[PDB]
Ligand binder design. Structure first.
Ligand code: ACO
Ligand code: ACO
Ligand code: ARS
Ligand code: ARS
Ligand code: ARS
Ligand code: ARS
Ligand code: ARS
Ligand code: CL
Ligand code: CL
Ligand code: CL
Ligand code: CL
Ligand code: CL
Lengths: 363, 358
């Protein structure tokens, strides 16, 4: 009972859309004959272009080559466009008569509901909405099972906080189970994954990327995450936080605490004098450090409680650059006394769309 | 047997705590053989609840029918503000305390400030003791004797529902002790001679005050907590129900759970209409919910099922305590209670008194 081509999955965000497409490479002479024109041209449209209209982009470097999907050999392609271009996408769906190939389209993402009726009225498609976390996890595990063209899908950072020594290093453990997934959007969900068909949300924290943005907008008068990060990257949090060395003069060995460990986040801001001279850049950085250090702590304690040694970090909170990621890397190493690393994934951001595609094969 | 009277002191930045063991088994002959200086100090302490201008004996906290170094009697809890300290030392000199003891056991971060005045004005040497050691010994001692046949320990039931909220009692080792100052340190206490700091968080009272001041223009703990008491955090935080239109059924996460602390403040429109009290309350709820989670996880890591909260962050307004109670309740799915202690504030003084016998 194999679903017919073409095979797509989508992740429709509030601001960003991701689309994944499987290109079959093993199409028989018999199949090529019975295939309708509509399909033939979408397939050639997808594979001969890497830019689609004003905003569509195929990330060629992410292409997974020579894999198996539902018993067929081919390649997986990763495409992106902003949500504002979505009306044009749905209009493309109508012009290319997509409904003649499929009545439905699998999609996850917080933006999906916004567009469900447009899909029906403009393209005569049913958007079949899926859970973000189930899609993420299924997509992640699939991409990890097939590998990144013989290279590792996973990576970590060595000496993250020292830009003189910081280095992305691959992590080639073939068997990822069990693992802990730390999903950081506006809030944070932490899932133990024991197998493809066996996982559960163990806990989470409300102190996430939206706390970071909410607090910076309030504290610094910025409006976007990009602004918040740009300030958080030039800042010095030690002006805002009271450190152990400020209380004890150095380490406090009795408590196993080094001088550079934070005693109280925002502790300097209890003084009116210090508040009146603090920089917008320092407040932003302090906000980011507080949140990343706290996520590292909670991730470490969960890893211990669940007896899991692999902690994988994904989510919106990690996009734009690597400031977030390197601070989480530092935090994980701190709380774990060097015994756990923060692990990250090359295909981060596309896992939802891959999990949506995979829904096609559930029967 | 050390001679009477038996005192312990904890001298803090704003409050001084004093505990006093009143012996209730004085013989007719002991009474005949006791110097006048002692007899009148005992009469003074026991016949008064107001001492000088600012001194208060808190009769509610009194422990009756204790035995202490083999004498039957009562322990009394007394306090006065630090600015009355000059008057207290003069009182010791006028009442000739040095004729009874040459030294006095004291802890607290102002035992150093006043050591010189004690020596010069009252001819008394302060024997200064470590704050943490005194806290632990006192806490453990008070828990071991109980509160007049009732538990020293209590929790709140239905903490955030004022119509339902009930302070209920809880009837030992090991326990986790969450000590909240400017930061939070968590200690595993296995017995009275063994405790170790197991972990903590830099997100505590200090973060609450610093963030409140920055967000609202307030300046003090008392002011931040009064605002946080009046505000509504749900205007500031994004709740699970905001995202899913109710519970997130897939993972059984309640609609009322907070999804993203300060998450509504990502919206310019929402920022322009928020009250400062709502921000204050969101700041507190964020900090306490988080402390709740770290404490719960630490209990799990340690296989310890008893979690006690103490520290100056609890004293100023009871709002902190109710939120911690709700948090522990939430993270443990009702399996762990936030435990609080009736004699909180005085444990250091009790620990100091106990040193008199070692
Ligand atoms: C007692 C207590 O409550 S203790 C606290 C306990 N709370 C918990 O354990 C829950 C912790 N939080 C979580 O687990 C997570 O936040 C979840 C699972 C609830 C939600 O997951 P998140 O990753 O935070 O959701 P996400 O960031 O995607 O937000 C959802 C959607 O809201 C919308 N959204 C995102 N940002 C904004 C914004 N700035 N403004 C308006 N809407 C937005 C988007 O459509 C987003 O979808 P998208 O990211 O696909 O584009
Ligand atoms: C990567 C990262 O950094 S993640 C963050 C990791 N950080 C942590 O885990 C630490 C979290 N914080 C904590 O555990 C606590 O804040 C501590 C233990 C550091 C400090 O204890 P707090 O209860 O917050 O004390 P607070 O900061 O309120 O005041 C410090 C007290 O220590 C006292 N002190 C100073 N030196 C000493 C000493 N040598 N011996 C005993 N006490 C001392 C100070 O005088 C002060 O006393 P006071 O209140 O009487 O004036
Ligand atoms: As299949
Ligand atoms: As991995
Ligand atoms: As004794
Ligand atoms: As107890
Ligand atoms: As109550
Ligand atoms: Cl497959
Ligand atoms: Cl679950
Ligand atoms: Cl993803
Ligand atoms: Cl005090
Ligand atoms: Cl105390």
């Amino acid at each position: 009972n194999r679903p017919p081509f073409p095979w797509f999955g989508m992740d429709i965000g509030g601001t960003l859309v991701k689309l994944v497409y499987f290109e079959p490479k093993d199409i028989t002479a018999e199949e090529e004959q019975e295939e309708v024109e509509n399909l033939k041209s979408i397939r050639k449209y997808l594979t001969s272009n890497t830019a689609y209209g004003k905003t569509g982009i195929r990330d060629v470097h992410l292409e997974l080559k020579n894999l198996t999907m539902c018993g067929r050999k081919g390649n997986l392609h990763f495409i992106r466009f902003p949500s504002c271009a979505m009306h044009r996408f749905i209009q493309m769906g109508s012009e290319k008569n997509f409904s003649s190939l499929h009545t439905t389209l699998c999609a996850t993402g917080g933006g999906a509901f916004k567009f469900e009726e447009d899909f029906r009225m403009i393209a005569d498609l049913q958007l079949h909405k899926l859970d973000e976390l189930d899609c993420l996890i299924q997509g992640l595990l699939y991409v990890d099972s097939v590998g990144f063209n013989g290279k590792p899908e996973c990576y970590y950072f060595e000496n993250p906080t020292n830009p003189e020594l910081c280095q992305k290093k691959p992590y080639c453990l073939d068997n990822p189970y069990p693992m802990l997934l730390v999903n950081m959007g506006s809030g944070v969900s932490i899932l133990a994954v024991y197998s493809k068909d066996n996982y559960k949300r163990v806990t989470g924290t409300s102190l996430g990327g939206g706390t970071f943005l909410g607090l910076c907008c309030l504290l610094t008068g910025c409006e976007t995450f990009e602004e918040a990060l740009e300030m958080a990257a030039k800042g010095d949090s030690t002006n805002v936080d009271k450190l152990v060395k400020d209380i004890y003069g150095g380490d406090y060995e009795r408590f196993g605490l080094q001088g550079s460990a934070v005693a109280s986040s925002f502790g300097n801001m209890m003084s009116k004098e210090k508040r009146d001279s603090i920089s917008k850049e320092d407040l932003a950085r302090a906000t980011l450090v507080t949140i990343t250090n706290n996520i590292g702590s909670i991730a470490r304690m969960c890893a211990l409680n669940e007896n899991i040694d692999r902690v994988v970090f994904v989510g919106n909170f990690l996009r734009i650059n690597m400031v977030s990621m390197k601070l989480l890397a530092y935090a994980m190493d701190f709380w774990s006394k060097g015994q756990l690393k923060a692990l990250f994934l090359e295909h981060e951001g596309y896992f939802g769309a891959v999990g949506a595609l995979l829904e096609l094969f559930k029967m």
